[PDB]
Design a protein around this ligand. Structure first.
Ligand SMILES: N[C@H](COc1cncc(-c2ccc3c(c2)/C(=C/c2ccc[nH]2)C(=O)N3)c1)Cc1c[nH]c2ccccc12
Length: 269
């Protein structure tokens, strides 16, 4: 075999957190760039099971819209995850505050968001947590979902399993996830997408949590869109968010339909 092909240099860190340390690894021969997550299984009850599922799931993914997987290699506590690098950073830094971005692009990024999700759900896999700082980019600004830590299989042998685990992100989390003891899983993800849109359409979140106890959120129901944060969102998409961000998860436009949307299939715009 070719010499020095297993050695990757550690240039800079891509992040930092309570998850671990995803460093940017570069080959030693080809200079092939890759990201490496350094999750640490500590003590005697916490990650050893949560990192296994992640590693266990990333072994199913295979789409140009999802953090490509390569492998891993356990070294006791220090675990290394080799996932497709991204020079296009996160979409999170592509959103201007109280502004957003060129509509013609949000429509774009949205599509890809649906492709990955479509994909996932296709094989019965919920991400249970979507958001800009997760939706990465590449050299061609091609959206690429990431972070399958809070992922879980909702469908196995054509037998959808309902959920109950309330793990996500309060603003981006669905509303029924904070109301019903049990609930489907596909929807929640779609709802989490709607935000992503307005997030790229308004350059600001809509609320803190989809609860009647939250000011604005209450108004979004009364259809109070007049000059509210949903003022920077033209009808075209806002009409889609009306259908998306719907109270009754048992009446929330799907993806096969999001696809059928009018703003969703509008040229350039
Ligand atoms: N590990 C997390 C980051 O979330 C991730 C979890 N799992 C996987 C990834 C991940 C996977 C593949 C990746 C990247 C990131 C990545 C990031 C990147 C940054 C700049 C350019 N590229 C890349 O190019 N390929 C990222 C750090 C964190 C944990 N808790 C936090 C609280 C606040 C801020 C950060 C964190």
């Amino acid at each position: 075999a070719v010499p020095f092909v297993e050695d990757w240099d550690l240039v800079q860190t891509l992040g930092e957190g309570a998850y671990g340390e995803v460093q940017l690894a570069v080959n030693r021969v080809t200079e092939e760039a890759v990201a490496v997550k350094i999750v640490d299984m500590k003590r005697a009850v916490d990650c050893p099971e949560n990192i296994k599922k992640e590693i266990c799931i990333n072994k199913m993914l295979n789409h140009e819209n999802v953090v490509k997987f390569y492998g891993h290699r356990r070294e006791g506590n220090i675990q290394y995850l080799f996932l497709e690098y991204c020079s296009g950073g996160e979409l999170f830094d592509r959103i201007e505050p109280d502004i957003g971005m060129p509509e013609p692009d949000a429509q774009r990024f949205f599509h890809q968001l649906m492709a990955g999700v479509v994909y996932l759900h296709g094989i019965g896999i919920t991400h249970r947590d979507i958001k800009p700082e997760n939706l990465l980019l590449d050299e061609r600004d091609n959206l690429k979902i990431s972070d399958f830590g809070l992922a879980t299989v909702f469908r196995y042998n054509n037998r959808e399993r309902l959920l109950n685990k309330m793990c996500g992100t309060l603003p981006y989390v669905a509303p029924e996830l904070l109301k019903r003891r049990e609930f489907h899983a596909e929807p929640v993800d779609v709802w989490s997408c709607g935000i992503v849109l307005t997030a790229m359409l308004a350059g600001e979140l809509p609320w803190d949590q989809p609860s009647d106890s939250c000011q604005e959120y209450s108004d979004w129901k009364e259809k109070k869109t007049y000059l509210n944060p949903w003022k920077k969102i033209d009808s075209a998409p806002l009409a889609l968010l009306h259908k998306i961000l719907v109270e009754n998860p048992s009446a929330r436009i799907t993806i096969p339909d999001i696809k059928k949307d009018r703003w969703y299939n509008k040229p350039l715009k």
